[PDB]
Amino acid sequence: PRFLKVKNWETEVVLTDTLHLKSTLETGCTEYICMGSIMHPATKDQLFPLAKEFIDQYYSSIKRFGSKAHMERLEEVNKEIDTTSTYQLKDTELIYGAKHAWRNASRCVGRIQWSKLQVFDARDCTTAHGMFNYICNHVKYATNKGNLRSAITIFPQRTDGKHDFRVWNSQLIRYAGYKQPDGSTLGDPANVQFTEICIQQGWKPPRGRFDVLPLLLQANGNDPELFQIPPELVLEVPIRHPKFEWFKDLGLKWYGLPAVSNMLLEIGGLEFSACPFSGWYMGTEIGVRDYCDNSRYNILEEVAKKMNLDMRKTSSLWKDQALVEINIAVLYSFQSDKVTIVDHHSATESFIKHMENEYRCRGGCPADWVWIVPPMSGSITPVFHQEMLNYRLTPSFEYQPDPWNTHVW
Amino acid sequence: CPRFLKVKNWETEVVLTDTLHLKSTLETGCTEYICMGSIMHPDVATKDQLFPLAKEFIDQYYSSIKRFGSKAHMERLEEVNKEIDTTSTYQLKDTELIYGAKHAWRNASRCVGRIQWSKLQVFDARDCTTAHGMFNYICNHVKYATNKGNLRSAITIFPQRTDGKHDFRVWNSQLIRYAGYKQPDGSTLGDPANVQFTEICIQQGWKPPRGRFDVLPLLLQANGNDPELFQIPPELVLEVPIRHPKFEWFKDLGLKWYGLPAVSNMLLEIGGLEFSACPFSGWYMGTEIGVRDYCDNSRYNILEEVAKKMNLDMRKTSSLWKDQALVEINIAVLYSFQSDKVTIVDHHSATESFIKHMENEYRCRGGCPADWVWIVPPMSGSITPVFHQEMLNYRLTPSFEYQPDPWNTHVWK
Ligand code: HEM
Ligand code: HEM
Ligand SMILES: Nc1ccc2ccc(CNc3cccc(F)c3)cc2n1
Ligand SMILES: Nc1ccc2ccc(CNc3cccc(F)c3)cc2n1
Ligand SMILES: C[C@H](O)[C@H](O)[C@H]1CNc2nc(N)[nH]c(=O)c2N1
Ligand SMILES: C[C@H](O)[C@H](O)[C@H]1CNc2nc(N)[nH]c(=O)c2N1
Ligand SMILES: [Zn+2]
The missing domain is CATH 3.90.440.10 (Nitric Oxide Synthase;Heme Domain;Chain A domain 2)
Structure with a gap:
């Protein structure tokens, strides 16, 4: 139980983390083994403390901790869990819960936007x-x-698991x-x-x-x-390149809306198994992962050929050259068609600013370096040199x- | 902890099972509730702290040479035990020194060059x-x-710590x-x-x-x-002057680097003994020079000057002019070393070799501690095989500290 410091090695800025002391879920690590690179590490009785915990932080967040309304809500929830083995969230709690799940998403570089989320109640x-x-x-x-x-649509919570x-x-x-x-x-x-x-x-x-x-x-x-x-x-956005006029001949395109629909939203012990949400793309998601992963569209070879690069040895870095060009094309294409997108330099800078905001107003920001750092040009973005602490706060996406x-x- | 921990490669779907983690010796800084994997850095030992550390190491050593429980093993234990009893420290045999040095490298989770661990020339300077x-x-x-x-690759090992004042x-x-x-x-x-x-x-x-x-x-x-x-x-x-295969002007930047990366400030820990002066060396991966030494903001910081000569649009970040320049610089570094016949390895080759090395270690040793945050190269991360590889990080001894x-x-004085 200590205040922990994180340092940026480039700017020398040191922040102090207290927020990690409020975390209750597990990371997957132990004293002896770190698992930071592993991708994937109820009953009434279980339910009420989880529910109470959430109502507590909700009323703490609107500066009414211990109010008439606070206690009444607690009474109301326990008595509802009692009778029905579950409980229903207030509209206000639902919206708060969803924003905070995004706020606590340690792997998301886009969290400066967290409080700007349009919540659709589909319960x-x-x-x-x-x-x-x-x-x-x-x-x-x-x-x-x-x-x-940015939006999220929230469908009815899990009951028995058979529905x-x-x-x-x-x-x-x-x-x-x-x-x-x-x-x-x-x-x-x-x-x-x-x-x-x-x-x-x-x-x-x-x-x-x-x-x-x-x-x-x-x-x-x-x-x-x-x-x-x-x-x-x-x-959708047809992909073309600002300098290579042959790039369009590749026939590539992508969709504008990244809308993750397979995650689980957890709020106050309640489980929303259907909660599709969306924001907008960071260029590298498409240009690096979608187009250039060997297990995905895998286009590096084709692009480098049209670039007439030397592809006989790896040390010519032909893969690296073609990668930058593909990512230039993606950004240029979206921008030309007025579709929202953010490059990894802009996105990572905002994240650093976001971290500083969170330490200042909340005493910390849970962050997963392995996911925050972009899949290309890592160390020429500020997050590479930023120490992060990762820990699991609820509400969350699971x-x-x-x-x-x-x-x- | 369970006896078996699994890691997956998300690109090849290959699954590996780690048992070696059971031999982990020290803390990582992580707990059940917090991960410290991106933290850079998260008066001598007594007689009684030293006995078990020496024994742990001597056992490991005799186990490695297939003479565990042998008479020579037991006589070595007894010799070490008495020596610690009569002097509060002990002296490693040359064979144990060489074994320990090589294994500190084998155990270095942040090192992507470990396929070479067993070819290490050990210079005894005790x-x-x-x-x-x-x-x-x-x-x-x-x-x-x-x-x-x-x-x-080589290491030179100077006398171990005694009272901490020498x-x-x-x-x-x-x-x-x-x-x-x-x-x-x-x-x-x-x-x-x-x-x-x-x-x-x-x-x-x-x-x-x-x-x-x-x-x-x-x-x-x-x-x-x-x-x-x-x-x-x-x-x-x-030293190697840096030039570029296409850009004639790149020589005009007047850049050069040294051929030999030789780290000299780390401590080597073998069987509880501490070698505070143990400079070691291998050879470079291009990105160490081309990305970090040359392009880090708090280092030589040449991206802007290089970009201006490439005549890039440097007004928006989204032109990726930084990314464009970064690659050409790393091309030049690799080209210059190769041309001058100085050993160097590009990040594609190095990470590909490391994956094979790691797989071999899981099979022959039951694991390979690895620090993904350090193993993945500072540019082009996801187009190297290590990015998609799950790893487990833990601390084995002998180790570099x-x-x-x-x-x-x-x-x-
Ligand atoms: C609005 C602009 C946004 C940007 C630029 C952004 C950026 C990103 C990026 C680049 C990743 C890594 C993606 C990958 O490599 O697969 C990520 C992960 C993630 N994002 Fe955001 N995001 C945005 C909005 C949102 C929203 C609205 C939510 C939820 C309400 C959200 C929740 C998450 C979660 C839970 C992850 C981790 C997913 C996982 O662990 O598998 N993000 N984000
Ligand atoms: C033979 C070729 C070698 C290559 C290509 C190589 C490659 C690397 C690279 C790229 C790093 C990351 C360094 C950074 O980004 O600052 C590293 C770290 C490291 N290497 Fe290797 N290395 C080699 C040889 C060696 C040898 C001979 C030893 C010791 C006997 C060694 C021990 C270490 C250690 C202890 C670290 C982590 C240092 C730290 O935590 O600051 N390496 N290596
Ligand atoms: N640009 C965004 C916005 C939100 C995101 C949320 C989660 C993920 C995780 N990646 C993912 C998740 C499900 C399916 C898939 F193909 C990728 C990426 C995001 N990418
Ligand atoms: N190519 C190599 C070989 C061995 C290495 C060992 C350690 C480090 C770590 N980087 C480092 C360590 C101490 C001082 C310093 F300036 C850099 C890099 C290596 N780089
Ligand atoms: C093995 C590793 O955990 C896995 O490949 C991760 C690495 N970092 C990542 N980072 C992001 N943003 N997205 C990813 O899918 C991954 N994949
Ligand atoms: C903050 C972060 O842990 C730090 O910048 C690390 C990231 N990964 C690294 N990886 C390597 N190989 N070398 C480094 O110096 C670093 N620096
Ligand atoms: Zn960890």
Whole structure:
């Protein structure tokens, strides 16, 4: 139980962390073994302290800790957990809970935006058709003709675990991936399995390189149902390069809206298994990971060829040159089409400013260096030289099992 | 802790099982509730602290040579035990010294070059008594390791710590580094990382040339005495001018670096013994020079000058002019070393070798401690295989450790 200091080795700025003392969940590390690079490390009785903990910090946050209203809410919650084995969040608590889950997301470089989140309460939803409707509205609001706005739509919380709401898509908008007879893959290889599942369910594939997948929506534990997002809601950006006029000939494009739909939102012990949320892209997510991962679109080789680079030895850094150029193209393309995007230099600078804000007003900011540092040009961004402390605060976004591994039809 | 910990590669889907972590010796700084993986740095031992550390090491050693529980093993235990009892310390056999040194490297979680761990030339300097002798040992090390460009890894090991008042120390952070000078106008000439050390050298009597690439003198402390200055013979200092295969103007920048990376301020810990002066050396990965030494803001900081000559649009960050320049600089570094026939390894080759090394270690040893934050290169992270590799970080002994800078602790005579 100590105040812990973090140092930036470039600016020499030292911050003092006290916030970590309030954390209650585990990191996955031990005194003897650090696991910082591992990607994936109820009952009434369990429920009430978790609920009380959350109500406590909520009333503490609006400067009414120990108020009439505070105690009454506590009374109300325990008595509701008692009778029904669960409880329902106030609209105000729901919005607070969702913003703080984003605020506490140690892996997210975009958290300077945390309090600017549009929260859609979908807790009255009963069917997959209703889910589809709420999701269309979410996509339309968030896309906003290219001026993207951060949003989250929250479907009903888990009850018995046999009636979960799940969006089976990993994101609301993604491209299909196809196994070919010659053993190669068409489209996005990361979605090959999901695409097969959709096909089995009756989806008719265009079998192109960038086919927008249908929504697969599961309501109240029932079999998931297929829906086609209205295409006019799906903003895409054809990728071209400001100097290489041949770049457009690659036929590359991407969607404007990154909308993660497979995570679990946890607030006060309650579990929201369906909580698709969205902001906007950092260029490297598309330009580095999506396009250049060997297990993804894997385009480095093709680009470097058109750049006429020497590809015989690795020490020519041909991979590195082509990587920067692809990322220039992505940024240039989005900007030219007036679609919100942020480069990794701008994003990491804001994060450092955000950290400083959080230490000042909250006494800390949980941060996962492994995820915060961008997948290219690491050390020429300020976060590389920033020491971070990682710890788990609630409310939070958590991983959950892929739905096809748990569901019985 | 369970006996089995699994790590996955998200790119190849290969899963490895670690059991070696059970032999972890010290804390990492992390707990169940906080991770300190991005923290840089998170008076002698008694008789009674020393017995178990020596035994732990002797057991490991005899186990490694397939003579565990042998008569020679038991007689070695008894000899060490008595020696600690009668003198409060003990002396390693040459074989144990060599074993321990190599294994400190094998156990270094932040080192991406460990596929080479077993090829390490160990120079035994435990007979050294003076700074002049330290200088002699260091010169021979530099000459051997350099090998006219065909670099060979080596370590030179000076006498272990006794009462803590007779430490041997190399005050230099590396055997070969460039001077930095703070100007009265606030600017820095040379390497800003070395300003403090440079000022100490000047104070001890060094006459600086005051240039951009002045090789610093050795500042050497033997047996707890005040440190002494020596100039490394310049013929022993292999350097490489930096030029570029396409950009003719790149030579005009007047950049050069030294061939031999030789870290000299770490402590080597073997079986509870502490070697406070153990300079070691290998060869460079390009990014160490091209990204950190040259492009860090608090270092040589050349991105802007390079970008201006590439005539890049440097008005928006989103032009990625920094990223563009960074690559060309690293191309030039690699090209210049290769052209001059000086050993160097690019980050693609190094990380690819490390993955294979790590897999071999999981199979033959039951694990390989690794610090992802250090193993992943400072540029192009996700296009190297290590980015996608899960790792477990833990501390095995023998090990290399940080120790306080000696000017903070030294009692001047
Ligand atoms: C608004 C602009 C935003 C930007 C620029 C941004 C940026 C990023 C980036 C680059 C990552 C790493 C992604 C990866 O490599 O897969 C990330 C992770 C993450 N973001 Fe943000 N983000 C934004 C908005 C949001 C919002 C609105 C939420 C939730 C309400 C959120 C929650 C998270 C979470 C939970 C992770 C970690 C996911 C995981 O652990 O798998 N982000 N963010
Ligand atoms: C033979 C070629 C070698 C290569 C290519 C190599 C590569 C590297 C690199 C790139 C780093 C990161 C350094 C930084 O970013 O500042 C590192 C760290 C390290 N290396 Fe290796 N190395 C080599 C040889 C050696 C040898 C011979 C030893 C000791 C016997 C050693 C022990 C270490 C240690 C202890 C660290 C971590 C230092 C710290 O925590 O500050 N390396 N190495
Ligand atoms: N630009 C953003 C905004 C929010 C994000 C939230 C989570 C993730 C994590 N990456 C992820 C998650 C699910 C599916 C997928 F393909 C990537 C990335 C984000 N990227
Ligand atoms: N190429 C190599 C070989 C061995 C290394 C050992 C340690 C370090 C760590 N960097 C370092 C350590 C001390 C002083 C210094 F200036 C740099 C880098 C290496 N780099
Ligand atoms: C092994 C490692 O944990 C894994 O590849 C992580 C590394 N850092 C990352 N960082 C971000 N932002 N996104 C990622 O998917 C990953 N992948
Ligand atoms: C703050 C952070 O831990 C620090 O900048 C680290 C990051 N990773 C590194 N990795 C290597 N190889 N060398 C370094 O000096 C650092 N610095
Ligand atoms: Zn840790």
